[PDB]
Design a protein around this ligand. Sequence first.
Ligand SMILES: O=c1c2ccccc2oc2ccc(S(=O)(=O)N=c3[nH]nn[nH]3)cc12
Ligand SMILES: O=c1c2ccccc2oc2ccc(S(=O)(=O)N=c3[nH]nn[nH]3)cc12
Lengths: 168, 168
Amino acid sequence: AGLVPRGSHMKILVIQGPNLNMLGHRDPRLYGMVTLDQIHEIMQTFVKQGNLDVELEFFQTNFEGEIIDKIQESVGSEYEGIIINPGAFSHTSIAIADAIMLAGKPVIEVHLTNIQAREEFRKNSYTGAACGGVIMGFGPLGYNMALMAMVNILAEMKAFQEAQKNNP
Amino acid sequence: AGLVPRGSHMKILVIQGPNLNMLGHRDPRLYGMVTLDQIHEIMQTFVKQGNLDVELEFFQTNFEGEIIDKIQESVGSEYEGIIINPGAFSHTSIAIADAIMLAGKPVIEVHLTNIQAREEFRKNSYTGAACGGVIMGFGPLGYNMALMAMVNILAEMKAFQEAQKNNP
Ligand SMILES: O=c1c2ccccc2oc2ccc(S(=O)(=O)N=c3[nH]nn[nH]3)cc12
Ligand SMILES: O=c1c2ccccc2oc2ccc(S(=O)(=O)N=c3[nH]nn[nH]3)cc12
């Protein structure tokens, strides 16, 4: 008793789906040539500026199967929550949505654009329905909003579980 | 020149739509009896904790027309941005969506629940499509996320407009 110091390395996995790696090379003039690496740096700076004890891991892929593999690799292993932008797969991938459903951890969906405001085929998100919450239309800023939420959620889950939940 | 001290009273209007006033009296056991007034207090505390120079005004109504009147009253007058939860009107009110479209200021939509994860009739948001961005499924926390975003947006709009934009 009293032998386990606190508190948190929170470990959050950020999964980016198809085409996002081309940000700032084709577009966005919409955010003035911000790149995907730059969004990731922005998230790291958010952590630093808040003096938060958070470890971020970043992963981008154009493959549905690589997204599912990555979600599965997190289930047994260390990552406490996932921030995901499945991009265009959000509207079609029942398989990714099911993988999220049974990930056993909080998952937050982010989109750069307001997918509710575009073509009819972009309005549906199977994956969004599986996630706890969805953020859309804030550009890179949306990712910092997702991080703010995830830190709150993971900090409160600990409080409950331990100290309270249990003092072995 | 140099005769106008800076910087910000940001004035943000928070508009809550139908049934939300009954939070914590019928539900949410979903958030343990949090009331609508309590959400508003949470937002005020967010401002205080960040030492932000932000003024919040709160308004709840069960009337579509009162929401439109309130949006209009902001156009000519002082409020720099709107955070809105139109609730069940989101799925049906073209009129509120049009009022948002021409509000001439940033408008962010928030829902407590993940409306993408419920009945088919709740998935559509006319109002969400009109807003710059949408946040759903974070409970009260979503409102603090909306505030974080709005402060960023309004701070950057000033930088541009003034100093840069213009030094009369
Ligand atoms: O805006 C972009 C974008 C711009 C330049 C080059 C590549 C790009 O890839 C993207 C991928 C996803 C998104 S997204 O707005 O984050 N998600 C979407 N879901 N369905 N459609 N969009 C925006 C984008
Ligand atoms: O969860 C509630 C709620 C619980 C107890 C009593 C009244 C309530 O009113 C609400 C009003 C709106 C929402 S809402 O999830 O923020 N927005 C919705 N749009 N369409 N359906 N829901 C949740 C709610």
